Amino acid sequence: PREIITLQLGQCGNQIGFEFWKQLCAEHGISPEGIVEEFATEGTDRKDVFFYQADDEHYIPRAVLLDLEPRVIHSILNSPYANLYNPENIYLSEHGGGAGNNWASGFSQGEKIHEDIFDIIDREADGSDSLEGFVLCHSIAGGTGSGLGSYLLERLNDRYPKKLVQTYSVFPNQDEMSHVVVQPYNSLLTLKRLTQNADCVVVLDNTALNRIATDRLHIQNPSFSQINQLVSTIMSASTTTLRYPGYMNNDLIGLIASLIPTPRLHFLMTGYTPLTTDQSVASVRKTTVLDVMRRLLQPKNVMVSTGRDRQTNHCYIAILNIIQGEVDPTQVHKSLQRIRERKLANFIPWGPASIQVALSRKSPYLPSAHRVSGLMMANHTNISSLFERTCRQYDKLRKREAFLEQFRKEDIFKDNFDELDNSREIVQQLIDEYHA
Amino acid sequence: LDVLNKNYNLLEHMQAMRRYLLLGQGDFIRHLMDLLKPELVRPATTLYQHNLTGILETAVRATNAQFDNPEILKRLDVRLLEVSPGDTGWDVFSLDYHVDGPIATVFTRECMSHYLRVFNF
Amino acid sequence: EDDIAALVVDNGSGMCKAGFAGDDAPRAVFPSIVGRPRHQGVMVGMGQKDSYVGDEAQSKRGILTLKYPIEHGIVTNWDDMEKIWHHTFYNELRVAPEEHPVLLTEAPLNPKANREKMTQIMFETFNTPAMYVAIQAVLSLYASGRTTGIVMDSGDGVTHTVPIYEGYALPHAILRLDLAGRDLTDYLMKILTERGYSFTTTAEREIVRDIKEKLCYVALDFEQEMATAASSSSLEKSYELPDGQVITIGNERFRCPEALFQPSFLGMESCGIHETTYNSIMKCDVDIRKDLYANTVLSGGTTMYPGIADRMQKEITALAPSTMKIKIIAPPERKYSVWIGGSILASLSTFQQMWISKQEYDESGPSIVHR
């Protein structure tokens, strides 16, 4: 019916998808090894849209996880949520990889394991006779998720041409350049494949993570154990129309169709306010829906590093405001009434704009059926500031003679560096041209 | 009001018809309308009905594992018009909520005749 | 009136028995259960509801969550005990308890603070004009004739041994024994697997409680009945069911009433039913002990067996002295024998100055239950 195959790949893409499947059992009322609660069918009306359909009421995840590093998968099998995963769909015990840290490693390893990489991931494709598409849950940081992920964006474009492609990709961190220095090279090589060899992306910045991780979360030493908490909730938040029973844009080709203006303009800004557990003691007094979307357009919950004074000459075109759970829908048109009076979104002068709001009932659970949740999927034309940030860090590195002799020994014979530079400037010029 | 709750589930069928003629839950109708399009693109014939009951019944089992318990699948059917076979084939298909006994006390002839009209739009 | 215009509520040890007075059979009996669906969503098969109680909760058990207000024969929670009282008054009978005086029961050994709790519930929420707190022990004895003698409470819950002398019970003789009918149905389950027959749902485990009172019989002299079973007599019965499970009995025909006198089959060192009968009479006054042996009355759901009157007679004579005239008075019905005693007490010639009304509750609080 609407079966999606997630493509978890890389050192960071496997960990953000590990707790994504772990989030799904707590809201479906199911255990990874059994069914102890009856809340799975009376409370939740649809479960076989991301999981594989049941053979013994055991909803297998439709997931594949490949990585060159064996460290990310050795921290999985000792956890009690790995018995839900199957040891025959992806790998058996003692799976390995390369050495290995290179963008050209996984780019060259795709055609030497070409027979095996297109054998076991295609067995899940013909399980349903109407496949939705493929989401590449991969990474941009490092050479593991960026090297091999650029290969599958090409060969799955023609072997599966009538399928939706759209990824939840995480952006790397640009604070210092000591541990990694190959960061401007492997990022722009995948970013070219994300626009012409891929339809849509969902950007997730790393410098904006610790802006939120010290905002309300109150940590002193930033660890990697907090990167899975902001990411796994908004992943399950994006499929609330798709997993839980909704009516309009209840498919993944429903939501993405109403937000993309044009190809190579698909970078969607994400926002999510409620992350604090001591808000729970004051949501008993009928906290309404009239105050939760006034702060979405206000740049506080954003996960995109952008300029603060660059929003006057940029214009919103498509903005999504997803409320979940208890909505009190007699005032949801009242919340959309107050949008035109502030004009917090700059509107495009050539065409109409749209503020789309939708709702779906959440899990039968006490932290879910009590507190209001707001998921934002914006589309603003100030996203070229990240593309100006990455390009200015790209041409400055090529004048310092950095990784021009250390990178072209394997499988690179011609200069494909300006092939990425002009196509990035094509994106940056067509964005500002789009508001005439 | 308590004899319907023990035997007939009268006002439960009030919520139930909203899922099909008013299209409350979309997964019942999207997995329908996906499977229903390869038949609606051709003009309708005499042999149009016997496949539509089979495409209704395999659409309600891909989306359900507990809906066999109530008495709703026997009180909903496929309604089709008397239109000549030289049409596009899209406007002939509709679903209707059937009534037999005490559910026909609360549902007379004027109710579903208006529900055909709200269905077509 | 109160011959017909008074309600007899017999809150038993697992079943609530409501009905108007003057009858010899209760109106509506069902097991006392409540059910809470912890969240909402869609409700299929039955109506959209935030709380299924009573008979709409017995059809959905793996769909609902189960809760017993009466465990060990004593009320453990007072919110769901009132919810069944709301269910019996307004849904299964549909009469307002604001003009009709209400006759409700209690345990013989419950504290006074519990007895003050149930007076506060009936006056405020249901607004009864008058009521009376009566023990279940005195109602079954009044249905057996005069109000002197000892009753053998063995229901679904905890066995009570209450000796009553002419309407007044003894304070320091109410012995509490943990032998229950729910222990015997669990005892029948752990010897049915030895036959090879098991369960897969809770519904197959429910009919064992029906077979405990239907198929199993009491034989006089259990001791030769196992000796004739050792010589392979005809005592094995196999009951047939609509589904594929075939529940048979072997030597468990006579053993579940034998577990009353022999608690070693239950796996405990506790006293038998005839022993806690004998231990209760052995601390009474010595002149009224003769009046207790000749008025032994059986009551409850565990005691529902044919041929149990002469078995209790032959078992008590080995401990009691042989000069006492002992008679086991076994009524034909005994689950409902408490209810018929509450209705014949309701049709008494004089009950009008024994009413606990709204006026005395406003003037002395709930301490007027001391009487």
User: From the centroid of its chain, how far is CA C323?
Assistant: 33
Contact status, residue A19 vs residue A76, Cβ threshold 8 Å = no
DSSP, collapsed to helix, strand or coil, labels residue A359 as strand
Contact status, residue C284 vs residue C158, Cβ threshold 8 Å = no
DSSP, collapsed to helix, strand or coil, labels residue C271 as coil
Q: Tell me the C-alpha distance between C188 and C182, whole Å.
A: 10
The pair of three-digit structure tokens given for residue A407, joined into one six-digit string: 């990178």
Q: Is the dihedral of CA A96, A100, A106, A112 positive or negative?
A: negative
DSSP, collapsed to helix, strand or coil, labels residue A302 as strand
SS3 content of chain A, % helix, strand, coil (to 5): 35, 15, 55
Rounded to the nearest 5°, which phi and psi values hold at A50?
-115, -35
The pair of three-digit structure tokens given for residue A287, joined into one six-digit string: 């906290």
Q: Which residues of chain C neighbour B2 with C-beta distances below 8 Å? A: 91
Instruction: Find all residues with CB under 8 Å of C58, minimum gap 6, and list them.
Output: C30, C31, C33
Q: Tell me the C-alpha distance between C30 and C56, whole Å.
A: 11
Residue A141 assigned as binding residue: yes
DSSP, collapsed to helix, strand or coil, labels residue C163 as strand
The answer to whether B15 contacts chain C (CB < 8 Å) is yes
Note the helical H segments in C148-272.
181-189, 202-214, 222-230, 255-261
- Chain C (38-67) residues lying within 8 Å, Cβ to Cβ, of chain B: 43-48, 56
Contact status, residue C228 vs residue C235, Cβ threshold 8 Å = yes
Rounded to a whole number, what is the distance in Å from the CA of A186 to chain C's nearest CA?
48
The technique by which this structure was obtained is: cryo-EM
Task: Name the β-bridge partners of C28.
Answer: C18
Task: Name the β-bridge partners of A269.
Answer: A378
Rounded to a whole number, what is the distance in Å from the CA of B25 to chain A's nearest CA?
6
Contact status, residue A145 vs residue A83, Cβ threshold 8 Å = no
DSSP, collapsed to helix, strand or coil, labels residue B79 as strand
Q: Tell me the C-alpha distance between C178 and C274, whole Å.
A: 14
Contact status, residue A297 vs residue A319, Cβ threshold 8 Å = yes
Q: Count CA atoms within 13 Å of residue A216 on its CB side.
A: 11
**Out of A38, A44, A364, whose CB is closest to C62?**
A38
Angle at C358 between CA C353 and CA C361, to 5 degrees: 90
Nearest partner of C24 among C350, C362, C331, C354, judged by Cα: C331
Q: Tell me the C-alpha distance between C251 and C216, whole Å.
A: 10
The answer to whether A38 contacts chain B (CB < 8 Å) is no
Angle, in degrees to the nearest 10, between helices A384-398 and A417-433 = 150
Q: If you count DSSP H runs as helices and E runs as strands, how many of each does chain A have, helices first?
A: 15, 9
- Choose the mutation target among B21, B27, B55 for the interface with A, i.e. most A CBs under 10 Å: B27
Determine the residue of chain A that is closest to C39 in CA distance: A364
**Out of B23, B25, B31, whose CB is closest to A45?**
B25
Angle, in degrees to the nearest 10, between helices A183-193 and A417-433 = 60
Nearest partner of C215 among C188, C194, C180, judged by Cα: C188
Angle, in degrees to the nearest 10, between helices C112-124 and C78-90 = 40
Task: Name the β-bridge partners of C34.
Answer: C53, C67
Contact status, residue C48 vs residue B12, Cβ threshold 8 Å = yes
Contact status, residue B80 vs residue B92, Cβ threshold 8 Å = yes
Helix (H) / strand (E) element for A431: namely helix A417-433
**Out of A41, A248, A250, whose CB is closest to B66?**
A41
Q: Count CA atoms within 13 Å of residue A414 on its CB side.
A: 4
Q: If you count DSSP H runs as helices and E runs as strands, how many of each does chain C have, helices first?
A: 12, 20
Contact status, residue A123 vs residue A86, Cβ threshold 8 Å = no
The answer to whether C286 contacts chain B (CB < 8 Å) is no
Angle, in degrees to the nearest 10, between helices C337-346 and C136-143 = 80
Q: Can you give the resolution of this entry in Å?
A: 4.8
The pair of three-digit structure tokens given for residue C185, joined into one six-digit string: 């149905």
- Choose the mutation target among A38, A57, A243 for the interface with C, i.e. most C CBs under 10 Å: A38
Rounded to the nearest 5°, which phi and psi values hold at B23?
60, 60
Note the helical H segments in A273-322.
none
Rounded to a whole number, what is the distance in Å from the CA of B42 to chain C's nearest CA?
37
Q: Which residues of chain C neighbour A44 with C-beta distances below 8 Å? A: 41
Sheet (strand C34-35) strand order: C52-53, C34-35, C66-67
- Chain B (49-68) residues lying within 8 Å, Cβ to Cβ, of chain C: 66-67
Q: Tell me the C-alpha distance between C266 and C255, whole Å.
A: 10
Q: What is the DSSP letter of A224?
A: G
Instruction: Find all residues with CB under 8 Å of C234, minimum gap 6, and list them.
Output: none
Contact status, residue A132 vs residue A174, Cβ threshold 8 Å = no
Q: Which residues of chain C neighbour A38 with C-beta distances below 8 Å? A: 62-63
Chain B contact partners (≥3 CB pairs within 8 A): A, C
The pair of three-digit structure tokens given for residue A379, joined into one six-digit string: 């589309």
SS3 per-residue string spanning A38-83: CHHHHCCCCCCCCECCCCCCCCCECEEEECCCCHHHHCCCCCCCCC
Classify each residue of C206-225 as buried b or exposed e, where b means 16 or more C-beta atoms within 10 Å of its C-beta: eebbebbbeebbbbeebeeb
Residue A223 assigned as binding residue: no
Classify each residue of A32-41 as buried b or exposed e, where b means 16 or more C-beta atoms within 10 Å of its C-beta: beebeebbbb
